[PDB]
Design a binder for these strands. Sequence first.
DNA 1: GGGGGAAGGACTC
DNA 2: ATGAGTCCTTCCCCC
Length: 341
Amino acid sequence: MIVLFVDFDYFAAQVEEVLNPSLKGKPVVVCVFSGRFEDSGAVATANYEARKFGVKAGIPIVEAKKILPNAVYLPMRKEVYQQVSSRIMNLLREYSEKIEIASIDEAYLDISDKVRDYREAYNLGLEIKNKILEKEKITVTVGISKNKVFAKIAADMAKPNGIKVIDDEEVKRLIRELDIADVPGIGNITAEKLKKLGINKLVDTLSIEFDKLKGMIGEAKAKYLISLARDEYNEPIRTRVRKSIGRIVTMKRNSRNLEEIKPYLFRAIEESYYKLDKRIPKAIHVVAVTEDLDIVSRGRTFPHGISKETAYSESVKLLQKILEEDERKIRRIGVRFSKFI
DNA sequence: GGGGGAAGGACTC
DNA sequence: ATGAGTCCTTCCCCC
Ligand SMILES: [Ca+2]
Ligand SMILES: [Ca+2]
């Protein structure tokens, strides 16, 4: 198989640059302001100018300003980035019918029936980077290899404004040499579990007893990693259909008082129904983030679609249950809708 | 034994 | 110490 992965460069920040070019060359930081206090919230994405100094997605906004007090700080404009992303995704469809939109700035293309080798594959990547640059003035990084996983790794290695092929021989190299923490789907919690087994490379998963591996990291992740180490990983490029839509908002102050929470919960439903646009959910889940950043949820499935008014009443009931069955204060509250008709 | 739903968990970006 | 969404695991009802 030949997979060509497109990863939009520091997307939200770069979009802000396209709309206001004077930002070029400067450290740009797109943030989500939580509104609890002055500058509360976190960084959603920074351009490379900002990243060079350790201003990155995830850190508090306050911290970022300590490091870069004179950087441009901008609020998330999600809807804008989405409209821009949609137009780019529409460009990529010109190069394959087999295309998987993984997120707002990631797309996988099965180009097996378009190019005969990696030479032709790498050229088509150039053609794609150019096209996106011509039409939208956005840079992207293209990663190419025999499966989705290594294509992503190609792009991890080449970003930003890059392009890389990981040919058959280098896959073998990487199975032996690549730090297993850098495998897509291996986070700190799992990396830690693995290192605690001597496993630092994909190849190591082939010499450990399977039950030992499964026993610690679960059956799926084990099968996953072994298949990669065997050079047998296969997952076809599939059109993804969204499976849920939801909104979760930060409360101005923590609480377990139902009337205090209701208004935030209700705003989350309003926004969610806006987002659903024509899709009718059969399942609603209420999601709370506790004071200690734990996540608790209660949901219910219906043998029919959920109307906004049913969402409103059921959500209160589900929030109650959360309050009855857990004593902590809530920091964040929201809703998630799924099981579309 | 395992299918399917609910809730918690990890990870992605 | 934000926000959105996906897949997996555990535990339990049930066949
Ligand atoms: Ca990106
Ligand atoms: Ca990792």
